[PDB]
Design a protein around this ligand. Structure first.
Ligand code: ZN
Ligand code: ZN
Lengths: 118, 59, 122, 37, 131, 204
RNA sequence: CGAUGUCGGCUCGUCGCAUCCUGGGGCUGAAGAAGGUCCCAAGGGUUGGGCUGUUCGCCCAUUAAAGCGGCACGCGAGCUGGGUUCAGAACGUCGUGAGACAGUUCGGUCUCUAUCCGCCACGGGCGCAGGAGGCUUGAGGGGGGCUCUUCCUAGUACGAGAGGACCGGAAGGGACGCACCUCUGGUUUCCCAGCUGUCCCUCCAGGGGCAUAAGCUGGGUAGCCAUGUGCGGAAGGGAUAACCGCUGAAAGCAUCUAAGCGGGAAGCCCGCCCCAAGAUGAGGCCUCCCGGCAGCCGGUAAGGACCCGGGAAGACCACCCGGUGGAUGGGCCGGGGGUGUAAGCGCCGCGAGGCGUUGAGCCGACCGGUCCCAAUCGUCCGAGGUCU
């Protein structure tokens, strides 16, 4: 019974879900747009929104917080420099999720791209 | 567990009967408002690459 | 929650030390014994030459439980032991004096003797 | 009510009556009160 | 509607306000009303608040004192009208919200792990000063 | 038989006479009447209540006509109180009063396809001593060749909960008219916000 | 005998009554209480443990009681394999021996996939003579049904006393069933903190991985939960069993019966809850809808569906909700809640560390707000009402 329990297991154990979120986020910031299965996307909305929110906060403590997950200096720099400004006046909704019409051939999985909002 | 096994051969009418619900619903399509092409709703038109009256993907 | 096979510290000076609950005298199929309950136990341990020696089957009463005890007010008490008083078959403490605190439910169950002897009723 | 199959008079006051289809040996003496069955 | 706001509305007529704030590790003497026989008398239960599950009006706390070499733990509804008054007899300096480990500690070590709270104590002396 | 619709907002204990009596809080009113089951017209006597109101763009034509036949606002949920002829046009908590015994019915928390232990409290099997893969199975289910079948209603797996449930003879701890809140001792079937219906108890 | 798996235990029951308790009653060598016996009665219950493979039995402590049996001495495509009964080994004994026991003793592989009927749940189709959307009723079916102690009655009746009532009320329990998470108590898989090793980021500091599919440890939200909370057994009505009667003839009397009428039980029916119109007998009420070729086709009405966004709804499906008019979910915000004073800095320390900043920082579900991001645009089905 998953009553009110939030979050998707995604058929990965805990640390694997977490590293998935980190790698997904890394590619997202590194590219803005990425293509991934739908549930990974919707389970990636919040995990990106939080990091970008700390981007909007921008202080050192946020630097080490987001750095706790991204684990990169350069990519975090781009985050606090290219993205923190461009989302400086947006409250939430830092990412957009669109479902693609064409499923993945290899398994019939449905695809959808997650993009940083403009 | 003593290896349960089908008792008798399934008659053809019964087989087809169980396969009755095996029909494949046709994938519902709506015309892309951009290029007038059919495609699944609530998705990006892979033809035009637009969505919500604006561009999303690079066709 | 006292059940059979449980060990109980005797809270009084009858001579025993611990008693193993082998029954709970509350109806036939009583699952658990608690404060103010009448259990029947064995003397698994007694001071030398006490009033009771080991192996005696004795009616006792639970006066403290490491399982807490709610109350109609909302408050609840929980000791850090399981204690009982070796009573006679007439609801009178066979021992002369009890040791350590006890619960107030005893007053609710006609154990004003044990309540009185209690150095600290709670 | 002595229930049995050989309901019979015991005393002269033992009086038989076929009540409700059954045979009852009704008597003033309570002990002689018999029901056939 | 706000189900939470309705809840706080209901409990709001019962929430007690005057009780002194305290954190775990501290020591308390609770003047707690009692209905013995038919009369009522307030007994003080003084121990360590080893736990405070904060659930608004349903928040309650745990006191722990050793009565005659016997660990006596007690749970009080934080807003119980039966609880007459609370007495912060000591600002122990806890370090976790829950202090169950003291169940297994000799009282020497119990004290040695619960030191006084210089900050909250000095705040106490700072307050408690009438006009 | 008076009764009002309501919604379960949550549980809580209060202090009534130095007793932390746990209660559940139920936003009952205000229930407007929408139609009255009269025996000459509907074969029996009852009423039909609306709770909560509904966005007018979310109501089909038929329902809308059903409201316009009354003078009632479009309402989300609509039910019937059997054998209850409210005089007013909107049943509220005023019909109830503290101390009054009631019976409450609501859908239990649907526990999906529940196993056999959780559904019927079967003992299952042991956890050691060699129990092979049957730790929570119901063991046997019947007899040998006679009757060589399984009786109707043999307790098996299935959806435990998610069904209508009526806990009865509860106490109306308190009424809150200005809020249309109701404080009923004991727990009520259903999740928080789950629709429920309160009625006079059939006990004595 | 081209296989019907054999004692026992477990799980799960169901049923008979030749009734162990609970209910009713008769008689008594029934003073009361307690009993005995029999009669009617199967609704419910019938405890836990020691010994033994055991069933059985004895015992232990209770209990109202600690029922007897059938169901392939129920139940191994549900479990175990203790016993019996494979192969090894040993003893007593028999046999020259090989070996034998019904005597003993230690050990000894129990086989993932359910086709059908059955059962437990959930659906699709069609039907329910117009189409939909709601509400219902309830044919009928299931669930449940229990029991004890104490108090008053009243130490009253009874009784030399001893002892000790009926009836009628009151309260409190045990087990069981349902529901729920306010409280207690669990979990609470990464929400918080700490710690060890290693390696890495980036040297310090600060962090990350790994140590489990949490490294360990200290907590713990919501949810799920019981050990926690509430509620239930009804009350009552009806016909009855045993049994007890009024009237009463046959049969001058009497007769509970033969005409009749009544009382009469944990019993049956209703009553309580639940399911329920496939109840094909397809029910009832409210509301909404209106042509080209018994029909046919048409777009279609109402409406629905598909499609999302979800949901204490859920295997799927279904059900519910929302769909720009939107707060449905993710964000964010605010509260809750948890962890427990972040980092950084300053100061104090040789340093480990400590102090202030600081109930700080972080913060899963919880409770509301905000349209920031998503439920875009949409498509398709779906009335022309059979006849007396
Ligand atoms: Zn296009
Ligand atoms: Zn006679």
């Amino acid at each position: 019974m998953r009553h009110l329990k939030s979050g998707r297991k995604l058929n990965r154990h805990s640390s694997h879900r977490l590293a998935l979120y980190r790698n997904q986020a890394k590619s997202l910031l590194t590219h803005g747009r990425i293509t991934t299965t739908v549930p990974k996307a919707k389970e990636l909305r919040g995990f990106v929104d939080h990091l970008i929110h700390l981007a909007k906060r921008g202080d050192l403590h946020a630097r080490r917080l987001v750095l706790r997950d991204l684990q990169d200096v350069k990519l975090v720099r781009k985050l606090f420099d290219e993205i923190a400004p461009r989302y400086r006046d947006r409250q939430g909704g830092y990412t957009r999720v669109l479902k693609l019409a064409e499923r993945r051939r290899g398994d019939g999985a449905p695809l959808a791209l997650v993009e940083l909002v403009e | 567990a003593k290896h349960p096994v089908p008792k008798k051969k399934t008659s053809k009418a019964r087989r087809d009967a169980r396969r009755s619900h095996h029909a494949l619903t046709p994938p519902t399509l709506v015309p892309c408002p951009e290029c007038k092409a059919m495609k699944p709703p609530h998705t990006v038109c892979p033809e035009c690459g637009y969505y919500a009256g604006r561009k999303v993907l690079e066709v | 929650m006292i059940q059979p096979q449980t060990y109980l510290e005797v809270a009084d000076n009858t001579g025993a030390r611990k008693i193993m609950c082998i029954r709970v005298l509350k109806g036939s199929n009583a699952k658990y014994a608690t404060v103010g309950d009448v259990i029947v136990a064995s003397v698994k341990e007694a001071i030398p030459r006490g009033a009771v020696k080991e192996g005696d089957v004795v009616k006792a009463v639970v006066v403290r439980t490491k399982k807490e005890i709610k109350r109609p007010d909302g408050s609840a008490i929980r000791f850090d032991d399981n204690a009982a008083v070796i009573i006679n078959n007439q609801l009178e403490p066979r021992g002369t004096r009890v040791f350590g605190p006890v619960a107030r439910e005893l007053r609710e169950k006609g154990f004003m003797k044990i309540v009185s002897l209690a150095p600290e009723v709670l | 009510m002595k229930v049995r199959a050989s309901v019979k008079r015991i005393c002269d006051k033992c009086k038989v009556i076929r009540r409700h289809g059954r045979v009852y040996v009704i008597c003033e003496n309570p002990k002689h009160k018999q029901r056939q069955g | 509607m706000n189900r939470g706001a309705l809840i706080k509305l209901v409990e709001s007529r019962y929430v007690r306000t005057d009780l002194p704030e305290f954190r775990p590790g501290d020591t308390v003497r609770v003047s707690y009303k009692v209905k013995e026989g038919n009369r009522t008398r307030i007994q003080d239960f003084e121990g360590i608040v080893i736990r405070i599950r904060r659930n608004g009006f349903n928040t309650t706390f745990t006191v722990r004192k050793v009565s005659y070499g016997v660990g006596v733990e007690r749970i009080f509804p934080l807003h119980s009208p039966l609880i007459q008054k609370i007495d912060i007899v000591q600002r122990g300096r806890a370090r976790r919200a829950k202090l169950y480990f003291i169940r297994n500690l000799s009282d020497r070590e119990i004290r040695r792990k619960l030191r006084a709270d210089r900050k909250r104590i000095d705040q106490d002396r700072a307050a408690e000063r009438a006009a | 038989m008076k009764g009002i619709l309501g919604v379960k907002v949550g549980m809580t204990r209060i202090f009534r006479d130095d007793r932390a009596v746990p209660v559940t809080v139920i936003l009952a009113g205000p229930c407007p009447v929408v139609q009255r089951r009269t025996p000459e017209k509907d074969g029996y006597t009852a009423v039909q209540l609306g709770f909560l109101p509904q966005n007018p763009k979310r109501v089909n034509r038929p329902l809308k006509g059903h409201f316009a036949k009354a003078g009632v606002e479009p309402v989300r949920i609509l039910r019937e109180i059997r054998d209850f002829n409210p005089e007013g046009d909107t049943v509220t908590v005023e019909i109830f009063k503290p101390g009054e015994r009631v019976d409450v019915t609501g859908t239990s928390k649907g526990r999906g396809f529940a196993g056999v232990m959780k559904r019927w409290n079967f003992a299952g099997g042991p956890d050691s001593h060699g129990a092979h893969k049957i730790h929570r199975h119901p063991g046997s289910i019947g007899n040998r060749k006679t009757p060589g079948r399984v009786y109707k209603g043999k307790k098996m797996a299935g959806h435990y909960g998610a069904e209508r449930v009526t806990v009865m003879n509860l106490e109306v701890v308190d009424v809150i008219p200005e809020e249309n809140l109701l404080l009923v001792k004991g727990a009520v079937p259903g999740p928080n916000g789950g629709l429920v219906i309160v009625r006079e108890t059939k006990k004595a």
